[PDB]
Amino acid sequence: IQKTPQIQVYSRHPPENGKPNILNCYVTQFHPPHIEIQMLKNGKKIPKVEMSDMSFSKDWSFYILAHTEFTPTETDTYACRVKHASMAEPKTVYWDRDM
Amino acid sequence: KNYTFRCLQMSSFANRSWSRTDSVVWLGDLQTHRWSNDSATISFTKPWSQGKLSNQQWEKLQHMFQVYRVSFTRDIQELVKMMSPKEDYPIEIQLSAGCEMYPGNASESFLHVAFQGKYVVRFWGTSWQTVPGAPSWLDLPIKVLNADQGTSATVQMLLNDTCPLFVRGLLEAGKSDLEKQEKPVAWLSSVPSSAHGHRQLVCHVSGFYPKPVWVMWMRGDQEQQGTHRGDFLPNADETWYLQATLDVEAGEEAGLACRVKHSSLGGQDIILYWGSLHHILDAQKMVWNHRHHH
Amino acid sequence: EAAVTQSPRNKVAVTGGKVTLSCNQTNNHNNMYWYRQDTGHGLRLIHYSYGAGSTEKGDIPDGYKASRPSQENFSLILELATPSQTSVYFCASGDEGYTQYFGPGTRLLVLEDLKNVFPPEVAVFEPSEAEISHTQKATLVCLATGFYPDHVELSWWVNGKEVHSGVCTDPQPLKEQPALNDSRYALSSRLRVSATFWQNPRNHFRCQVQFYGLSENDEWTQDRAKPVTQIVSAEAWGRAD
Amino acid sequence: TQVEQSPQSLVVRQGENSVLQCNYSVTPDNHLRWFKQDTGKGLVSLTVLVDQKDKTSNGRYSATLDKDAKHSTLHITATLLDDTATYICVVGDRGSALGRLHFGAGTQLIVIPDIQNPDPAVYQLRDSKSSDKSVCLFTDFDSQTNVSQSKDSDVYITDKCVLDMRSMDFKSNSAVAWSNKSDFACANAFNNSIIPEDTFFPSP
Ligand SMILES: CCCCCCCCCCCCCC[C@@H](O)CC(=O)N[C@@H](CO[C@H]1O[C@H](CO)[C@H](O)[C@H](O)[C@H]1O)[C@H](O)CCCCCCCCCCCCCC
Ligand SMILES: *[C@@H]1O[C@H](CO)[C@@H](O[C@@H]2O[C@H](CO)[C@@H](O[C@@H]3O[C@H](CO)[C@@H](O)[C@H](O)[C@@H]3O)[C@H](O)[C@H]2NC(C)=O)[C@H](O)[C@H]1NC(C)=O
Ligand SMILES: *[C@@H]1O[C@H](CO)[C@@H](O[C@@H]2O[C@H](CO)[C@@H](O)[C@H](O)[C@H]2NC(C)=O)[C@H](O)[C@H]1NC(C)=O
Ligand SMILES: *[C@@H]1O[C@H](CO)[C@@H](O[C@@H]2O[C@H](CO)[C@@H](O)[C@H](O)[C@H]2NC(C)=O)[C@H](O)[C@H]1NC(C)=O
Numbered sequence: 001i002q003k004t005p006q007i008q009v010y011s012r013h014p015p016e017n018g019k020p021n022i023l024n025c026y027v028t029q030f031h032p033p034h035i036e037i038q039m040l041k042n043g044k045k046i047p048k049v050e051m052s053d054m055s056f057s058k059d060w061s062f063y064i065l066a067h068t069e070f071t072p073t074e075t076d077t078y079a080c081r082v083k084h085a086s087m088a089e090p091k092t093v094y095w096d097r098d099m
Numbered sequence: 100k101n102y103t104f105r106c107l108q109m110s111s112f113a114n115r116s117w118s119r120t121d122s123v124v125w126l127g128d129l130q131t132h133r134w135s136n137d138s139a140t141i142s143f144t145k146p147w148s149q150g151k152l153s154n155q156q157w158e159k160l161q162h163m164f165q166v167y168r169v170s171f172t173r174d175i176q177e178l179v180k181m182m183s184p185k186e187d188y189p190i191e192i193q194l195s196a197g198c199e200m201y202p203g204n205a206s207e208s209f210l211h212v213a214f215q216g217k218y219v220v221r222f223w224g225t226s227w228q229t230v231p232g233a234p235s236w237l238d239l240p241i242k243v244l245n246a247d248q249g250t251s252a253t254v255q256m257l258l259n260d261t262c263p264l265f266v267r268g269l270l271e272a273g274k275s276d277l278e279k280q281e282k283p284v285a286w287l288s289s290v291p292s293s294a295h296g297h298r299q300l301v302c303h304v305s306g307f308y309p310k311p312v313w314v315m316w317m318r319g320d321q322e323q324q325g326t327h328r329g330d331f332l333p334n335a336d337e338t339w340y341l342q343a344t345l346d347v348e349a350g351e352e353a354g355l356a357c358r359v360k361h362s363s364l365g366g367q368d369i370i371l372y373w374g375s376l377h378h379i380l381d382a383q384k385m386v387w388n389h390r391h392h393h
Numbered sequence: 394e395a396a397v398t399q400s401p402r403n404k405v406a407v408t409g410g411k412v413t414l415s416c417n418q419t420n421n422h423n424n425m426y427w428y429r430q431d432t433g434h435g436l437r438l439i440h441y442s443y444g445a446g447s448t449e450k451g452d453i454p455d456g457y458k459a460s461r462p463s464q465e466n467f468s469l470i471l472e473l474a475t476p477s478q479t480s481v482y483f484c485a486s487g488d489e490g491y492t493q494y495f496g497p498g499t500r501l502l503v504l505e506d507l508k509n510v511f512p513p514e515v516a517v518f519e520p521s522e523a524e525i526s527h528t529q530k531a532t533l534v535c536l537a538t539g540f541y542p543d544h545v546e547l548s549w550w551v552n553g554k555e556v557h558s559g560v561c562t563d564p565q566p567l568k569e570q571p572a573l574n575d576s577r578y579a580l581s582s583r584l585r586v587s588a589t590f591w592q593n594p595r596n597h598f599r600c601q602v603q604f605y606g607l608s609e610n611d612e613w614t615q616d617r618a619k620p621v622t623q624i625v626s627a628e629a630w631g632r633a634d
Numbered sequence: 635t636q637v638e639q640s641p642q643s644l645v646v647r648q649g650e651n652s653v654l655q656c657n658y659s660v661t662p663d664n665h666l667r668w669f670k671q672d673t674g675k676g677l678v679s680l681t682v683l684v685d686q687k688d689k690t691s692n693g694r695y696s697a698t699l700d701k702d703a704k705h706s707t708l709h710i711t712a713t714l715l716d717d718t719a720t721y722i723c724v725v726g727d728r729g730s731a732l733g734r735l736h737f738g739a740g741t742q743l744i745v746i747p748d749i750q751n752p753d754p755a756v757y758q759l760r761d762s763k764s765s766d767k768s769v770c771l772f773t774d775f776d777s778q779t780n781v782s783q784s785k786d787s788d789v790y791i792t793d794k795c796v797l798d799m800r801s802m803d804f805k806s807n808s809a810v811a812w813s814n815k816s817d818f819a820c821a822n823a824f825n826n827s828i829i830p831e832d833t834f835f836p837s838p
Binding site: 423424434436438489490492495497517518519520521523524528533534536559561563564567571579581586627630 | 793
């Protein structure tokens with residue numbers, strides 16, 4: 001459409017298998033501002049996800065922060081699925097604690 | 100030291116009939132106001148967002164913005180009919196209005212407008228002006244906007260007088276929140292490098308406020324010049340996240356340390372040594388099957 | 394110093410016939426506007442333009458089409474005329490400023506058929522002796538009667554020259570059969586002179602009416618004469634007795 | 635209705651003052667314009683008010699504007715007979731071409747002349763042609779007297795018409811009544827109206 005978004009998945013506190021934490025998804029550099037963002041646990045969408053007030057930087061690029069409560073483990077899969085007019089298919093980005 | 104106050108307007112025009120205007124307001128890196136298309140009134144995201152203004156002064160300022168929101172929408176809707184078919188839907192307008200506060204009884208006020216993602220028009224002095232390299236078909240719409248002397252007179256006042264007076268009192272009202280110190284918490288992790296036999300050492304540092312931080316990979320008194328300072332990622336609790344990367348040759352990890360300097364710590368920097376028992380104990384708490392890694 | 398002209402000043406149409414109301418401005422005004430004025434309302438916006446090629450819908454655009462072929466001309470097209478479009482249409486123009494400069498207007502009457510279109514019958518009524526004797530003044534009364542539509546302009550002419558002094562013409566005509574809608578109208582007017590002026594046999598008086606009816610384009614099949622845009626008159630001479 | 639004008643119509647004596655009112659609900663309200671429209675003529679601008687509390691003057695035409703009470707008033711002091719027209723109030727919602735104009739329905743002003751010496755009379759005028767038809771003329775009555783139309787469908791009664799024979803500096807009102815009937819007499823033609831006691835009914 002115009003600009004492709006940049007999805008960044010990171011935890012608020014240091015990750016510990018079993019301790020509750022906050023998983024953040026920071027979507028940036030996208031245009032137009034219409035975007036569909038969802039957070040996934042294993043394969044299904046997380047039914048209660050909070051999102052910030054859609055804003056923009058001094059370079060006129062939009063940004064929005066999505067965050068949810070989660071308990072990291074050795075086996076449970078976590079990802080941020082994003083649907084934008086710039087991509088023909090939704091770009092899902094998994095959470096890599098070492099990244 | 101120097102705080103920029105910015106009102107950000109996001110206006111999206113899908114077609115002749117559908118439109119929506121959403122706005123957010125900032126004082127430095129802290130959100131002060133929220134105004135959605137679905138909301139009749141402006142909402143406060145801080146208890147001091149009204150500043151030193153009265154419930155009367157704020158309501159008068161509110162009504163002004165309330166008629167502006169309905170007027171602007173029809174105004175640009177008519178400017179697309181004027182340019183038609185030179186510019187067609189969907190259209191995206193962005194306004195960045197406000198003022199930066201400098202030491203002394205002085206400030207610089209701004210009003211920048213971006214069309215379809217690109218900065219094209221600014222309010223300067225007594226009129227709307229097209230910036231250098233702006234498309235020529237914007238001349239007639241700007242000539243028509245400059246014909247409106249009432250909007251021009253109020254915008255002149257709103258920038259020169261209202262913005263400095265409102266923000267001078269906004270900083271005083273929200274002193275405790277702006278000057279709040281949040282201690283950072285750091286952790287270490289490693290990922291494979293793009294280069295064979297190399298490893299990317301990652302130092303995650305999160306939950307710090309204010310934004311200015313110092314993070315470095317050290318080897319004693321030697322700042323590892325390969326350390327890459329990432330972007331500032333925000334936290335939902337109005338704090339910050341930043342990570343510093345270091346590409347090492349696998350086997351060279353022993354000896355390294357992530358050193359982080361912040362205002363909240365008070366000289367007591369966080370020195371996070373790689374092979375330390377604290378890291379070994381930490382590393383084991385975050386183990387996984389590495390499924391769907393990058 | 395900023396003029397706007399409209400054509401025609403008056404128009405008669407058949408329900409279902411194409412009508413084109415023209416507007417012209419030589420002020421080099423970019424934006425042009427088409428309004429219609431009706432009794433009980435203000436001017437309502439039908440269509441407007443922002444330059445040559447542009448035509449945008451107004452508040453009441455149903456049944457109307459618009460065309461801006463140049464900076465100077467702007468048209469209002471009625472591809473299928475209806476009796477609800479019977480109105481008086483005003484044109485305006487303007488620059489980037491808020492001021493709109495208005496035209497003289499255009500009277501449009503949309504009737505079922507031209508079968509009820511009739512020209513007037515003019516008669517000049519001579520002053521009474523009772524007035525001449527009592528007031529030492531004399532009033533001539535003109536009666537333009539049995540015409541349809543109400544699009545008229547009555548005029549007084551004495552010894553060849555037009556008069557405006559002592560003349561008084563009804564602002565509005567009156568319906569002959571007020572119950573009926575097709576109703577043919579009547580209009581009266583009076584010229585008042587001095588008794589000595591009327592009592593002069595060398596003085597010739599004439600009431601001539603202007604009628605805005607049919608055109609050469611309009612097809613006529615009825616037995617009686619074609620009721621085209623006509624000028625009917627009646628005359629009376631001064632009397633010594 | 636976003637623009638309302640009161641009264642719908644006003645009658646004033648020649649030389650007296652006229653006050654016309656305009657009240658609106660237009661948002662936003664950039665300016666208020668007052669137009670003069672003669673019967674069958676176009677719209678001639680008289681004055682434009684632009685400030686929250688404005689006052690303007692065009693010689694004999696003066697106007698106020700209170701953008702808070704969203705109300706304007708037009709003063710026509712020492713009204714002439716030529717001031718008989720519809721006065722329209724317009725409200726513009728922008729200070730440019732982007733704005734829409736919101737027109738009032740207008741207020742009809744009727745300026746009646748002073749009849750210094752009323753001489754009410756109903757005369758019968760006969761056609762110049764050998765037609766035998768005729769008309770009735772109610773003339774020289776006071777400007778206070780209003781001509782009532784016919785309650786009879788076969789009788790046609792015109793409205794009052796003031797003429798001026800400039801050289802004599804004399805003005806007179808008149809109405810015309812007629813019928814295609816035999817029964818119809820001029821003495822009882824205008825009896826639907828308020829006829830003065832001293833009205834002259836000459837016999838034929
Ligand atoms: C929570 C934060 C609020 C978020 C806002 C954040 C962004 C901050 C922007 C600050 C500007 C707002 C102050 C303006 C008001 O004081 C005056 C006002 O209400 N103007 C109306 C009505 O105007 C009408 O009503 C007024 C009543 O006061 C007057 O009478 C006036 O004369 C009359 O015309 C105009 O339509 C607005 C038109 C401006 C358009 C400028 C945009 C540039 C176009 C870019 C070119 C792109 C090309 C287009 C495709
Ligand atoms: C708000 O602040 C702005 C400045 O940021 C003021 O703009 C200035 O306005 C004056 C007129 O009031 C402009 O001056 C003019 O300069 C030209 C020559 O350039 C001269 O020919 C004129 O006679 C006049 O002196 C001035 O240029 C303009 N500044 C800029 C940068 O354009 C504005 O007036 C202030 N408004 C209020 C309400 O305080
Ligand atoms: C104008 O654009 C909007 C948004 O693109 C269209 O709105 C959509 O309408 C359909 C049908 O009513 C809904 O299912 C969608 O959810 C709407 N989208 C949104 C975001 O609200 C609108 O229909 C377009 N109009 C025209 C005539 O093209
Ligand atoms: C954005 O806001 C406008 C109002 O500022 C919305 O328009 C109104 O929608 C309601 C729906 O019930 C109507 O009854 C009003 O008459 C509309 N008002 C105006 C001034 O337009 C609009 O629908 C909103 N758009 C979106 C996408 O939410």
